């Protein structure tokens, strides 16, 4: 115990400097992670608006189309 008493208060230092910066990392990783989720469902809705539209612009050009139908043909 001449030096096996500064052996043991330096295992519960490292055990409290590696388990806790572990902790805040693993937060940060895990507050990013919820960002990247959060990302995800902008895209999924900003896309899902897009489509919708896309399916109007569709819907013109088919009317567009049948107006040439007649307005076109002999």
Do not use: N, V
């Amino acid at each position: 115990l001449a030096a096996k008493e500064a052996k043991l208060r330096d295992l519960e230092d490292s055990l409290a400097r590696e388990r806790d910066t572990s902790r805040r990392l693993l937060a940060e990783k895990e507050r990013e992670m919820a960002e990247m989720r959060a990302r995800m469902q902008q895209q999924l809705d900003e896309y899902q608006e897009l489509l919708d539209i896309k399916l109007a612009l569709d819907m013109e050009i088919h009317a567009y189309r049948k107006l040439l139908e007649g307005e076109e043909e002999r």
